[PDB]
Design a protein around this ligand. Structure first.
Ligand SMILES: [Mg+2]
Lengths: 184, 186
DNA sequence: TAATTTCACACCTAGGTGTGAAAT
DNA sequence: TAATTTCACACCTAGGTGTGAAAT
């Protein structure tokens, strides 16, 4: 049975315990931590296509009040979510199992008319990253193939235009090399 | 049915290098070409899917030497390695998509490491090379070994690979035109 | 309306330049 | 052999960070 392992799980757990937030911007923001995985148990010679997308975790809009995230009401409408085909697809099980799998092109935006293929999200809504394995050797075969979808609830997050919980901001500062200029 | 037209971008700059005898530095870690090979396509079927590619092949079977300020054939070429065929990352894509932007392979890299495992283009120093652009009307990467390639040659992009510039006039053009080298501008 | 969104900044990482001289 | 290949370096490009004041 193919199995998927989340990389840097201890760090995802630290963020998740405090309520993960991801900033979104018109021009596109990277996710931090990045969503990275390792696959095992794939048939070595069979061909697979690896993909990832982000979907709404529920149909609620949230607000951060009294130091907590709470559902404020029903969610705004959602845009179709970019499905990313990993650039090495299709590749053999062997090939996929010898590398950490990540999606470098992924970026989050709040611009609903974005034309860059970014993942479009509603600020103050909750999202769940999903990883997919499809046993097929033709990208065009994707609309007729079964997707095995791997969910890691510890990577769930609320999208925001600016951080709400300072404890999340501190973890981002202390762990993302690009933000080290703000470290004490 | 289409009627492709391939236009070389920044030809004026390519001509300036070509008139002096273009050289491209190659390194173990991989070196970008400058000028980068960029083109614009017209005449594609707007809806059809195309795969666009590029590779660099030997321009002849000679080894060169730069002496008395001139490039001259020194003898027969050394054996060559297979050459990374670059599939443009945006591939596959519709004809309309392709015609809506300059097609650049500025990320392709040149190396002298015959054991390279990065997919870089492997060249022999002091040998002459010709970049090639290819258009494939096919909607899947796996059908390339069997698909028909239309190949476009631009002789003005021919260059000799080196590990260090030989002709100081070429070094000056690289300095004066490549933003990454502007620190060396007068 | 209060909250949320935007933007110019000063840093940060990653990595593309030819140089000058050592190493082959 | 004498020329070619290598590499740390200063100086660059390119883009990823949160900040906090302004705008909505
Ligand atoms: Mg571990």
């Amino acid at each position: 049975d193919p199995k998927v392992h989340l990389e840097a799980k201890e760090l995802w757990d630290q963020f998740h315990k405090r309520g993960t937030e991801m900033v979104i911007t018109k021009s596109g923001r990277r996710m931090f931590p990045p969503f990275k995985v390792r696959c095992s148990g794939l048939d070595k010679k069979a061909k697979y296509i690896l993909l990832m997308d982000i979907i709404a975790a529920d149909d609620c809009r949230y607000k951060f009040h009294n130091s907590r995230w709470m559902v404020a009401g029903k969610a705004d409408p959602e845009m179709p979510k970019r499905m990313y085909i990993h650039p090495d697809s299709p590749a053999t099980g062997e090939q996929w199992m010898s590398k950490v799998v990540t999606f470098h092109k992924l970026k989050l935006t709040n611009n609903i008319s974005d034309k860059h293929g970014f993942t479009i999200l509603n600020s103050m809504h909750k999202y769940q990253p999903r990883f997919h394995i499809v046993r097929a050797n033709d990208i065009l075969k994707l609309p007729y193939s079964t997707f095995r979808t791997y969910l890691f609830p510890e990577t769930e997050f609320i999208a925001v235009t600016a951080y709400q919980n300072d404890k999340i901001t501190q973890l981002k500062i202390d762990n993302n090399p690009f933000a080290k200029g703000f470290r004490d």
